[PDB]
Amino acid sequence: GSHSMRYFYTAMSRPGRGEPRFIAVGYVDDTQFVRFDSDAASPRMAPRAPWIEQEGPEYWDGETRNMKASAQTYRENLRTALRYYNQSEAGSHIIQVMYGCDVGPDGRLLRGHDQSAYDGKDYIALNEDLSSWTAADTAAQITQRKWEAARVAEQLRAYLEGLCVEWLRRYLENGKETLQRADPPKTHVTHHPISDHEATLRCWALGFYPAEITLTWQRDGEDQTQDTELVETRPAGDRTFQKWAAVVVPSGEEQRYTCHVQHEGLPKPLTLRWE
Amino acid sequence: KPFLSAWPSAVVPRGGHVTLRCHYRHRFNNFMLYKEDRIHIPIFHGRIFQESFNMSPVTTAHAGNYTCRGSHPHSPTGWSAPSNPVVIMVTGNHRKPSLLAHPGPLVKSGERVILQCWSDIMFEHFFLHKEGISKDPSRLVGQIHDGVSKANFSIGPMMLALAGTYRCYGSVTHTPYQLSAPSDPLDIVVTGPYEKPSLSAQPGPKVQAGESVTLSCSSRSSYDMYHLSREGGAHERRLPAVRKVNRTFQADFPLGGTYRCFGSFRHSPYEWSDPSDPLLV
Amino acid sequence: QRTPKIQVYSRHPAENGKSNFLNCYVSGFHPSDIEVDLLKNGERIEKVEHSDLSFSKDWSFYLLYYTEFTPTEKDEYACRVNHVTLSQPKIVKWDRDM
Amino acid sequence: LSSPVTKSF
């Protein structure tokens, strides 16, 4: 604990370039484990992590049927959205959905999520109580009224309390030695002159999992959170991540600078310095 | 290979218009077209289309099965692999057939319906086509029996995507891409799972000519419109819902027969609520 | 509409003559169509794969493009990205220190 | 496991 499961759907129209497309991916924490893509010749839900591969045929068949139905539903939703926004049928549009559950150390539900977007902006979201909606605009308010009349929130709440948690628990067990074993970052500091008065100090963290990490620069103990260049955390391609933090320092003052690394794989936080 | 498409529809009436677009290497220009029997023989004496091909007005000569190839200069052959095939079907060439739903056009969510096309003309094939969709029409061979040809299209489990206005067409032997005039249309509506409204009569369901009676459709659900249907098979009446002081949503239809009402929402005409309980007037 | 952020980097610390993976991570873009090539000396590498399309909490998309490669002193690698938000392709060189 | 709940707009 704590852990999460999330599914992400992208449904896109593209008149004249292709058939509408629906892609779904599933994650446990920062690890992707399934995918479905409607463009595939024979679309199926398929494994994207080794620990799900030995799941039986009934799992794959069921998930495949579910994804096919969701794809149909979201293609139609794109049409509906065109009417809601009085948009032409020539333009390309995107619906995105992310949903899932967070659980604690004890495997019990902490929080449920269900959010949808249209053309990259909030469209409609299930509230924290899992029994009511927040609609972002008048179109979405139409969707809200339908979902209230159809008791959708009750069904989704039932999913989030039941299957979502139960299956997340199963996957965390199936993949225990990867999903529940933090990999500490391997760290180092590099030094690169800028002028004959200034230099860059770069603090590196590589090969860590999960993605959550904190890199800070201090100068005699004061965070330079205002004067730090921080790159976005990036995937290594092997289910580990990388990040660095850089700070520009006056020449000959390198020693008052310290890099502080915080990650769950580390016994104690690291304090590094260049030499 | 390129992506070939027909716009706005591959099913198109004579006299109408349809444009073929050949999308390849992130552009829509420089392509050739081919029809199914002559596959390596480009049509129009190898015309190299500089942009989308607009066929307008549409004639029967436009009906056919097309693929395109896009230009590819710095490659072994001058051109790409063949695209997906697009079949342009031209309508309006025979008397229209008839289309009916069994048991009816109002279809409960998750259930199935049969759309039967039939004609006293011998059509070798029947085509079923939902209005506005780029879905290729469904095709079935006609079955001959007792002086009619006919086909049964099974639709469902019913969802919004299956709901809408349908027409059917026949084609005759040797001109398979030439379709009849369309049948009269059928609106196939999905009902549910939205909660059923309440139906009532004011002052009541007992009326004697000539006094006024208004039927009211009401719900706690925020329906935008109500539909009043009489089993006697007059096309449903529709009225906007009005929000009341106690927060219900209601429409009043001022007017015998057995009635039901359904709610629906803005911009969403082919999905209705579960039906109210019946009311006898 | 959101233009892509781009990072180019290796899976493991680079060592000339040692098999490795070259990565181009594109993120923060919207809409989803995007073209990404890894270039070797200005020239497109052919056998490049990518991750399944996904997105962040702010709804912007991200993809990782990657190829197996063995680095050398002379060879210069880069990532070339085009998107609707860009008038011209953006090109980012692989610098072993970034 | 993915959600079996239909989300029709």
Author numbering:
A (entry chain A): 1 to 275
B (entry chain G): 7 to 261, 267 to 292
C (entry chain B): 2 to 99
D (entry chain C): 1 to 9
Provide the authors' original text about this structure.
Killer Ig-like receptors (KIRs) are a rapidly evolving family of transmembrane glycoproteins expressed on subsets of T cells and NK cells in humans. At present, the best characterized function of KIRs is the transmission of an inhibitory signal upon engagement of HLA molecules. The D0 domain, a previously poorly understood feature of KIR–HLA interactions, contacted a conserved region of HLA-B*57:01 extending toward the invariant β2-microglobulin molecule, thereby acting as an “innate” HLA binding domain. In contrast, the D1–D2 binding face contacted the Bw4 epitope of HLA-B*57:01 and position 8 (P8) of the bound peptide.
